[PDB]
Symmetry: D2
């Protein structure tokens, strides 16, 4: 068959026994792919080849680089995207996302050099002086950190992790100026590395003065979304929404869960956020590493029940930084993220600094296409419906009804006509197997649609005819030509179209089953 | 609500039902229910279909019933907003076997005793002279089928007979269950296979009579093969090719070949009268649930027929068993429930129709819809018909917003049939200009028919909204929804038939 | 072919479509049969005919009748019961029950529609205390309204009659609302559709039946659906089509026993009605969705930390896996057998016992076939336990339940006494 | 709550995922076996003693390298380090010894030492029996004299873990075009993902290799490169009479062994999804499909599955695993794996102890988050109605243990099958198996949820005080290991006469 022999079972155990590797995919990719842009992927020549490989969102990590650096790669990103803006049938939009530095704590300058590297010995002594004079004179005896209140959160007998938590220190003697530490498992040290204090209440603002600069800078560059790092409560997401103000009212706020406080208040944060990012990098240091998988599936399942997007984040094909092929564990982590119900998957250092930025985006596209097919659609569509509440919205009743018609006639796609994208988000939350072709006039809506799994946005640049009925039916024939060209369906097939009864947002209420012309 | 057991533990008797009765009621017209005066009170009490039993009656007598029923339907039918169609059904005679007259007058009776002896004879001399010693039946070849271990039953299976000897004419018998033997009583022969055809020459004239009277359906009695379903369809011809055929299973062969007859018919009637005598009586409940379940899987109507409220022939209140029978027939999934002797000759006709309406809408309000709609979709295939996908997608939205009803514009009713296949909780309003299809709509559960009276407008798009606004007038008046309730409307893209696609969620104006 | 083709369907809808009338049932009937003894069944020779036809417990209505006649019917019921006592293998205990008159308020011929009447008057206390002297096994306390009434009855029968189980008959609107407080206070509930169909509207006497049967099924207590189920059989030798489906659906809904009132007391066809009920209930038992009832009975079941409660659930699970012939249980008070029946197995539960009152009382529960062992007690407790096991095997082979070679499940214990059932073993029939 | 009980009482797979809590600490013991390969980083006795304290259950010897004398000292040091704890049998942990055959592998020759290759140059493969000790960046040499008759113009050969792969442009000698480009070293592995190689699964070198394990009393065999059931037949025939009870594990590493899996599973005692060589013979984006399919079919058949290579690969150079490597082993035991493995992480790594402990903590947390309410239901629905009395006891023992929430299920067994039949229905409670057979105690590490304990006391006379002796032996081991307290209810399974195959009676006894 073609994936369809597995999804036709009465038990979850038999569904696994029917997973055939001789069954190829057929539909398009439903999981968006976010790649981090860096010095290995900044030229317009490579940025164009990434779009032809599967990239949908360009991420800029503002933990490094100056504004002139990020303004250049933004201009380079947009340049390589309009490289295909000629034919509007094959043109694929991509989005630009800003990543916050947040309440980060770093170390000083190792002997006044940005490339120096001291060597901690297994079991040596280390002093952590809160003074200033050694911020450019860091040797294998004294360490300088920029956290002023490091003494007002730690005590004698605490753990301290530096640079991705690879080296660890224990506090023996703790004064008020410094704190004597012993290397519990050391190695190579470096300059400006991140330090983690698991088990302490760090009182950093989580919306500092540097965050105001890059947020205001991001509004001026017209970015589509923001990844606020280290969100600990709903108060912080509210602080982000106020800083963006009226100029940035239409950009999406995605909260990065990275510490124990944010996990304990996930329901608090989700209700105030537009999306969630499972940032497993920092999260794996503040909590035990063996518990990360429990927190991941917990957040994917909760936001799936609310219809809000979540991303899987760092270290998915990390070995591909120095190798053209990933490892067996990495080939399964991406597959098991789509199966959990993730909306997008992300690449960080794999596309920013690695030696094979293209083959990493190619590998993610291959695995996600296979994982989307072997999804138990009988159990998923029933559970999400049974847990969904009774609604008075006509759009939601049309949305859930269109997905039932989608599974009934085994349709090729679901054409939805929206302007803000809200009518398209309500269809994707019920996860139809058929792709959702959301035709829009709003270029921002076309870029922001990459966050809700199943949506394939197309942007129509035609003028508007006088007869509204002719303008409505004009957007549908565009989606028929786009789907027929890209290989989604052929003439004679059956698709589902979603329209409304009046112009303006919030009126999608008619569903028609139309044959493909 | 997740379990079947807790659903039963949560049944409340102080929570009255709402909506309306979705299960249809078929009543048999007889000497006690024949006047145009009483027939007007049967429609007001819950009647939907009129059945004429052609087992005894000439064509002149039945033409008066049809002329009387239609007089009562279109009687106070000046308001189409409150007009309820009433269908007409013809029950075939079939290969019946009757006895002879007792001592010269159907009125006399003899007293048979257990362990005594009786003789059966086909010699037509004894015809109007059957006594307690010699019995006559109109089955000529009643000897080439029954062996020396046969078992004959007379008068609703109440008098048993054991065929001791046999021969050519005669057959010696020993009475097993005695009683009062009358004249012209029915005879049932279990085990043996009858040689009389299911479509006799007397039935051929009975069927051509129905084509000329504009009858909506026929109830063919005693069907064993699908060839029997083909003989009736042939004589109905192209002039009556639109009437629906409802096959009756009353024998062991018809049940053993039910799958064959289901594909060669439009509907099914579980005629439990003769069926309870042909097979063991304790096995009838197995056969009823098997047929209703198989037809629900296919979308064809079923009817539960005889002795539902049998006590109501003499008494004005039914027994506890008859109450738990009508309700358990709706919980089984029957499309309609019937009355026979309760309305044809009993002393309480409208009183039994009221009771069968009280219990039916009480059972619909307790149906476990959560796992019924789920199981129906899981066993129905993926079709290419765009109407099937529009139908299954419309009633799924009917559950999401707790819709008031589902308005469907149908010409031949085939659209509304596909909607009712999945059994939503909301009522299905069907608007049509075809009176035959508005009468034939009670065969399917949940479809409330409404016939339109206004002429066709010039603009077709204006013709659709004229009928959509009519169904909400019949609904707001009857009490199906109020001002501001979300409902489901179903239409198509072009005039004609077979183009239903469009589904619109709209509030009541 | 006990309708096992339908007992393996994936959906409940498909389970109906597999019901084959040509699939004969097993030889064991689980639903109890209760007959009301009257002028048409007071003989000692027809009462022997009502045995071997299906009667399990004889109901004696006390709304009219004197103690001299009631004790005479009790005298001949026991006479026709010990008729077969000249065979410990084929013998079958028969119980006796007392339906108290209660607050009837007649004016010469029944009829009538708070009543302010007591739960038990002087005529009730005398009739109730009369059952203690006559060794009745169970009482049908009529017209209960609250737990106040069930307690006011258990007090008048004090110490000599404590093991006698009371059965609350729901008959009015009060008990329909205060059902839960009357359930936990009683030992079993009877659904009297006759006296209840007049009070509540007729069109609703089926939601109350199904609701009461399921709640008692959940809690694990007996339920009985009683009056007019074969009413036409009083004057006619055949039942109607509606009556045959009434008894069938009653067994399907989950009733423990079915009752007959006027059909056996005053009527022309008494022995015939006792056989139609046996024929029907044997067929409705084969057409049961065991795959859904057992999983739902356990899903709502608690986490009772009783060692005997856990071995019961495990024994019913071990019987479905091997298609066993029966579940053998050694019990002294029936409680060990009442817990294996709570989870509704398919095989019969043969309960061996020496207590004769527990054998007669085992008819209140579904699927329990009690047999009484008359052999003397052995000096070695081990040889005495394995003796009652072999006695149960020969009984099953005689009544045609299994053959030398089939598998059975035996429940025994670690210590002589009561409340120590914790040993389950799978052994082949020798 | 604790032990993730909140997620267990759910009614949907979705809501069960939202109720997962990280403040719900695991309470039960670890129910997943651990296999670590021994090498220069873990060969010494003192380092071997620490690996047991960390949770090592099976020591695997890899026979693609090393001599017979080299492996003989490895088996000696393993056995020496484990009876270091045999003083008190109330805390002794058994340990199995696994055999991994070299099998049919093709490897290149020496060079000149590495030589880079271009993105589109030419390399002529030479099968000349020159025994190339000099292979420059043009002319390579293999030891497979059949690649000419097993490939055609347009084929593909992978070199060095599938890092460098060429295409078969022309033929007749073996000219090829570099379709990848890398650094080719001396004596590297080669993979031919196509036609059938005529190399024997049991080659002359492996015949003396399997006989060596029979003479050394190994406990299991990891047959490398199994494609047909005749291979599992031929391997069992080579073990012969002396090694009758050695469990054969067939490694699925190519496309033939996957298309004939039902044939190989029915003829083997177990399976291992060797994701290493398999990710080269098949597309890397499809190995996850084969992983979940092969696990689900053994759970349906009651046989063990091992997930093998590259589970914690980064722990070779760093002391902490990547967040993608922590999710791999958690989903592995969530898919139904019986044991997890480590290859180069314990043989030549720099942090071997930290790898064993990391695999221990993850599996313990992941076993607590298993949806048993659906797992136990589907396991019975697909298991057929057998009339094996020992099968009905096990299904009844697990059903009873869920009703009373037993702390353990004590099972006595002489061969192991009694405990294996209980484990196949996946009880949440740990299965305490008691036996006097050391081999049966060591092999029981292959079945998920079995805690083997060896009884060294002599056999008593009366068959009554001797059964209650071994039941109390599990009672004290449970109280010592902190499984339950004096007063809790347990499930004890026993027979009716000495000997195997009489597991029939189940008892619910209180802990004294
Ligand atoms: O998704 P939203 O923002 O509610 O918008 C959907 C709306 O789009 C509309 O097509 C409005 O039409 P225009 O965009 O062409 O004005 C209506 O179909 C519907 O109300
Ligand atoms: O007869 P069917 O198959 O039920 O279809 C009903 C038809 O009614 C329509 O609404 C048009 O009917 P009219 O021609 O009477 O206006 C179509 O959309 C549809 O094809
Ligand atoms: O049903 P009950 O009253 O709990 O009986 C259970 C008892 O029966 C036994 O099997 C044996 O009872 P006896 O010693 O009285 O013969 C015990 O194991 C157990 O305690
Ligand atoms: O597990 P196996 O090998 O099938 O046999 C287990 C048997 O061993 C027993 O422990 C008794 O045999 P032993 O003589 O070895 O103690 C019983 O519990 C059981 O019948």
């Amino acid at each position: 068959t073609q994936q369809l022999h597995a999804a036709m079972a009465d038990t979850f155990l038999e569904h696994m026994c029917r997973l055939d590797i001789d069954s190829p995919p057929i539909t398009a990719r439903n999981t968006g792919i976010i790649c981090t842009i860096g010095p290995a992927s900044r030229s317009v020549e490579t940025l164009k080849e990434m779009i032809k490989s599967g990239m949908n969102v360009a991420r800029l990590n503002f933990s490094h680089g100056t504004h002139e650096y990020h303004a250049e790669t933004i201009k380079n990103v947009r340049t390589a995207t309009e490289s295909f803006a000629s034919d509007p049938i094959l043109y694929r939009p991509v989005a630009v996302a800003l990543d916050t530095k947040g309440p980060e704590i770093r170390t000083g300058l190792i002997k006044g050099s940005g490339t120096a590297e001291v060597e901690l010995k297994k079991g040596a002594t280390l002093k952590i002086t809160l003074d200033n004079a050694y911020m450019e004179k860091c040797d294998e005896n004294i360490l300088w950190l920029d956290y002023k209140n490091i003494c007002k959160v730690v005590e004698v007998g605490s753990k301290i992790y530096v640079d991705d938590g690879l080296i660890s220190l224990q506090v023996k003697q703790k004064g008020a100026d410094f704190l004597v530490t012993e290397v519990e498992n050391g190695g190579s040290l470096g300059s400006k590395k991140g330090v983690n204090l698991p088990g302490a209440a760090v009182d950093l603002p989580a919306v500092s003065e540097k965050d105001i600069q890059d947020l205001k800078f991001g509004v001026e560059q017209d970015v589509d979304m923001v990844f606020a790092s280290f969100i600990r409560k709903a108060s912080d997401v509210h602080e982000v929404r106020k800083v963006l103000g009226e100029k940035g009212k239409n950009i999406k706020i995605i909260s990065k869960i990275e510490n124990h406080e944010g996990v304990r208040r996930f329901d608090e944060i989700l209700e105030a956020s537009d999306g969630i990012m499972v940032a497993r990098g920092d999260l794996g240091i503040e909590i035990p590493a063996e518990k990360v998988f429990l927190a991941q599936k917990m957040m994917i399942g909760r936001c799936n029940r609310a219809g809000k997007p979540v991303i899987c984040a760092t270290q998915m094909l990390e070995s591909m930084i120095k190798k053209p092929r990933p490892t067996r564990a990495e080939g399964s982590d991406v597959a098991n993220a789509v199966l959990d119900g993730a909306d997008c998957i992300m690449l960080s250092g794999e596309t920013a600094k690695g030696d094979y930025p293209l083959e990493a985006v190619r590998m993610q596209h291959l695995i996600a296409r296979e994982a989307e097919a072997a999804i138990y659609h009988l159990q998923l569509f029933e559970e999400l419906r049974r847990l969904a509440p009774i609604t008075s919205d006509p759009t939601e009743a049309t949305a859930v009804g269109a997905v039932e018609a989608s599974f009934k006639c085994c349709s090729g796609a679901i054409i939805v006509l929206t302007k803000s994208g809200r009518s398209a988000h309500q269809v994707a939350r019920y996860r139809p197997r058929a792709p959702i072709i959301a035709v829009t006039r709003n270029p921002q809506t076309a870029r922001q649609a990459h966050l809700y799994r199943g949506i394939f946005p197309v942007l129509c640049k035609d003028p508007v005819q006088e007869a509204w009925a002719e303008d409505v039916d004009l957007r549908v024939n565009f989606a028929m030509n786009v789907g027929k060209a890209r290989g989604f369906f052929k003439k004679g097939d059956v698709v589902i179209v979603l329209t409304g009864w009046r112009p303006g947002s919030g009126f999608t209420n008619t569903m028609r089953v139309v044959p493909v012309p």
